[PDB]
A = this chain, B = another copy of it.
């Protein structure tokens, strides 16, 4: 049975066409998403959550957001390499390599580790071996990036059936290929990137009409906003700068994202990090305990919300379209669950956005739809 795979910059999702319906599969960690993170520690290499859970402690051996480099040449990525803590070096071909303890990997090899783990754990969950997949890529990827992604799947031991666009995969998952003439604005906000795509769906041609976005705007920026708030409140209370202790900083990142997620369903939550630091005078343990209201959370992220408007406006103008001429706005990415993002979408386009399908599963589901179709299997 063929599967769909969302090779995302932050998380990856696998799904399979089961009985005409896409089903997302759990990983070994019991989670429907696998972080796109590989950790090279002194021992067995870590891939997934266990890698992301130690990324602050192991900056030299943890490779994250490798998707920003896959398929590009170094002269084009010099700046983004200055923004990463791991070593990014050019290859014999002008390519990109990651150097850990002197060893050298390609972004296709790093990506292939994430893909292999997804297929391994999914094959266990399904009780059959998975060898054929459809992998998705951002609409703005070129042939080099599409082939490099296809290579990453082959290296992981997969027969790659097709490399399709993420926004198309989303439209497939929402079934907008079955509603005649649709003009779809895909509003993709994920871990680190923001992506606006305008699709002219009609007579079966998914014609991309405009792209825009923000390559450094995502849910992790909301996370850091909480982190800086929590550390400032702790320096003021105890004179301890938790951002200087990699162990305390790693728990702040972990606790911040958890509180943000809880605040997508409720008005107030409490961050509690016991034994976070030692009191400088008495050397006794210190426990962080703060309550974050959604109201404060939204004040902290407002500059991120205000930057959503630009890409949306530019994509409309680049396509010659009015908010009124958009026939459907679909929400993609785990970060569109923030109620404030949803309101921002309403205010930007004057329409109620489709939120039927899980936003962090919609790509993987559409990709699995494509897969089953290429293999004869149908939909409902």
Residues on A facing B (Cβ under 8 Å): 17-21, 23, 26, 29-32, 162, 164, 176-183, 201-206, 265-267, 272, 274, 287, 294, 327-328, 339, 351-357, 372-374, 376-380
On whether the beta carbons of A378 and B203 are closer than 8 Å, the reply is yes
Closest to A355 in B: B21
Could you tell me if A352 and B203 are in contact, using CB atoms closer than 8 angstroms? yes
9 A-B contacts, Cβ less than 8 Å apart? Answer: A17-B204, A19-B203, A30-B294, A31-B267, A177-B378, A178-B179, A204-B376, A274-B274, A374-B374
Complex alpha-carbon distance, A352 and B16, angstroms: 11
- Contact partner, A373, options B31, B206, B287, B373, Cβ 8 Å: B373
CB pair B202–A380 under 8 Å, yes or no, is yes
**Complex contacts, A176 vs chain B, CB 8 Å:** 180
Known contacts A19-B351, A272-B272; A181/B327 CB under 8 A:
yes
Q: Of all chain B residues, which has the CB nearest A171? A: B378
| Total identical chains | 4
Note all chain B residues with C-beta closer than 8 A to A18: 204, 352
The answer to whether A339 and B180 have CB atoms under 8 Å apart is no
Contact B26 A328 (CB under 8 A): no
A162-B373 Cα distance, complex, nearest whole Å: 13
| Residues B203 and A20 in contact, CB atoms below 8 Å apart | yes
Q: Which of B21, B31, B354 contacts A266 (CB 8 A)?
A: B31
Query: Which residues from chain B contact A30 at a C-beta distance below 8 Å?
Result: 265-267, 294, 339
Known: A30-B339, A272-B272, A352-B21. A179 touches B380 (CB 8 A): yes
Contacts of A266 in B (CB 8 A): 29-31
Contact of A178 among B353, B372, B379 (CB under 8 A): B379
Q: A21-B354, A204-B372, A351-B19 are in contact. Are A180 and B177 (CB under 8 A)?
A: no
In the assembled complex, the Cα of A177 lies from the Cα of B20 at a distance in Å of: 10
Chain B residues lying within 8 Å of A354, measured Cβ to Cβ, are 21
Q: Complex Cα distance A274/B273, Å?
A: 11
Contact A203 B380 (CB under 8 A): yes
- A203–B18 alpha-carbon span in the complex (Å): 8
Chain B residues positioned under 8 Å from A177 (CB to CB): 378-379
Judge whether B31 and A265 touch: CB under 8 Å: yes
Q: Which of B203, B267, B272, B294 contacts A351 (CB 8 A)?
A: B203
Q: Select from chain B the residue with minimum beta-carbon distance to A358.
A: B356
Question: Is the pair A204, B378 in contact by a Cβ cutoff of 8 Å?
Answer: yes
Query: A202 contacts which of B20, B202, B272 (Cβ < 8 Å)?
Result: B20
With beta carbons under 8 angstroms apart, the residue of B327, B357, B374 that contacts A180 is B327
- Chain B nearest CB, measured from A209 CB (Å): 11
Distance, CA A29 to CA B266, complexed state (A): 6
Are A380 and B204 in contact, CB atoms less than 8 angstroms apart? yes
Chain B: minimal CB distance from A205 (Å): 7
Which of A351, A352, A376, A377: most chain B CB closer than 10 A? A352
Q: Report how far A307 CA is from B183 CA in the complex, Å.
A: 32
Closest-CB distance, A286 to chain B (whole angstroms): 14
* B32 and A204 within 8 A (CB): no
A182 to B380 Cα, complex, angstroms:
10
Report A110 CB to chain B, min CB distance, Å.
25
Which residues on B sit within 8 Å (CB–CB) of A179? Answer: 178-181, 380
Q: Residues of B contacting A328 with CB < 8 Å?
A: 180-181, 380
User: What's the nearest-Cβ distance from chain B to residue A173, in Å?
Assistant: 9
- In the complex, A354 Cα to B181 Cα: how many Å? 13
A376 and B19 within 8 A (CB): no
- Chain B residues closer than 8 Å to A205, beta-carbon distance: 377-378
